[PDB]
């Protein structure tokens, strides 16, 4: 690929659930009927070209397409195949993420990066096994 290329609005985006390598992507998800016409595109590794991509659109009219996605920018997501936005529904007195035409804001945040590498150094969230220097 390119290698640490930037991120532009309107470009096709691919996601990945980290420890469980199930590429959340355009799948034929026609199971959720909380709203009775809505998809719930979930987790399955079927990276298959066209049915592989969500797409960004900006939150509101402050940043147009071609501009670089910055930290803290809330965003809007959408499939290309179903073309439902990433909907945050309310199924039964509780939250239910679905995919519908009522959009929803979806804020991103930083956690780490490629330069933010351990090479043995500690990083938060990492598991470990504690050790005594004498008693092991």
């Amino acid at each position: 690929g390119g290698g640490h290329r930037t991120l532009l609005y309107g470009h096709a985006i691919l996601l990945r659930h980290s420890y469980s390598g199930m590429y959340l992507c355009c799948l034929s998800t026609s199971r959720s009927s909380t709203d009775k016409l809505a998809f719930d595109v979930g987790l399955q590794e079927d990276t298959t070209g066209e049915a592989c991509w969500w797409t960004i659109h900006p939150a509101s009219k402050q940043r147009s397409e071609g501009e670089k996605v910055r930290v803290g920018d809330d965003l809007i997501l959408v499939s290309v195949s179903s073309e439902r936005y990433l909907h945050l529904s309310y199924g039964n007195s509780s939250w239910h993420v679905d995919a519908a035409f009522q959009q929803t804001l979806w804020s991103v945040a930083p956690i780490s990066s490629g330069s933010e590498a351990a090479q043995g150094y500690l990083i938060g969230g990492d598991v470990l096994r504690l050790l005594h220097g004498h008693m092991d």
Binding site: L88, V108, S113
Partner: peptide, 29 residues
């Protein structure tokens, strides 16, 4: 900016019980 191959987490804000419950997307596949 956001690069390719960077660890992100997703967030949203929605009202419930008349209280803005900010949440994060989650999944256990």
């Amino acid at each position: 900016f956001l690069r390719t191959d960077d660890e992100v987490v997703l967030q949203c804000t929605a009202t419930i019980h008349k209280e803005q419950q900010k949440l994060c997307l989650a999944a256990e596949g």
